[PDB]
Structure 1
Amino acid sequence: ELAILKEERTTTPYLTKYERARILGTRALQISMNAPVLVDIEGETDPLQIAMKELSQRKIPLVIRRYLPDGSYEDWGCDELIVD
């Protein structure tokens, strides 16, 4: 109906900072609610530093749904998008 295949993807393949902000907030909220961490834990035990330790390595199980302004949307995985 709306959705586009993952090959016509003409939006920018970067994370930008607003996207980055929401990913950090939501991943940190999950790991605050006892979602176990994929990366090592040295001294970074506060959840925001845990989230930046993940995004440093690009280890994030989320999906951006950019609503393109028709209404359709490009399901970008985190794994493919280039971390700034």
Structure 2
Amino acid sequence: ELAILKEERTTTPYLTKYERARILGTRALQISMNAPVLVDIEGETDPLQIAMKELSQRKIPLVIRRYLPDGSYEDWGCDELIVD
């Protein structure tokens, strides 16, 4: 009902800076709470740096839910949103 189908999604296909910041913060917190890491870590130890490395490779297992003003929403995977 409220969910919007993937074919009719009309929001921007890019990761906004607020979404990028929130995704990085959440992923860093989850890694700091011993969540599995989906990318190989060479010598990195900072959770934020690991989160940035995951984001650059489109490996973050999170979904953005963008709320339209009327209450409907669109679910975008972080692996399908374009990041600068």
Structure with the larger helix share: 2
Q: Report the TM-score, using the length of structure 1 for normalisation.
A: 0.94
DSSP-derived class of the 1:64 partner: strand
Unaligned runs of 5+ in 2: none
How much does 1:67 deviate? 0.3
* 1:43 Cα deviation from its structure 2 partner: 2.1
Moved more, 2-11 or 15-24: 2-11
Cα RMSD over matched residues? 0.9
1:50 aligns with 2:50: yes
Give the unaligned 5+ runs of structure 1: none
CA–CA distance in 2 between the matches of 1:4 and 1:38?
A: 29
State the percentage of identical aligned residues. Answer: 100
Local SS of the residue matching 2:6? coil
Match of 1:26 in 2: 26
Deviation at 1:77, TM superposition (A): 0.9
Query: What are the superposed Cα offsets for residues 26-76 of structure 1, whole Å, 9 maximum, x if unpaired?
Result: 001100000121111122111000001101111010010100111000011
1:51 and 1:68 map into 2 onto residues whose CA distance is: 28
- Give me the whole-angstrom Cα distance separating, in 2, the residues matched to 1:46 and 1:54: 12
- Count matched residues: 84
The runs of at least 4 consecutive aligned structure 1 residues that moved more than 6 Å come to none
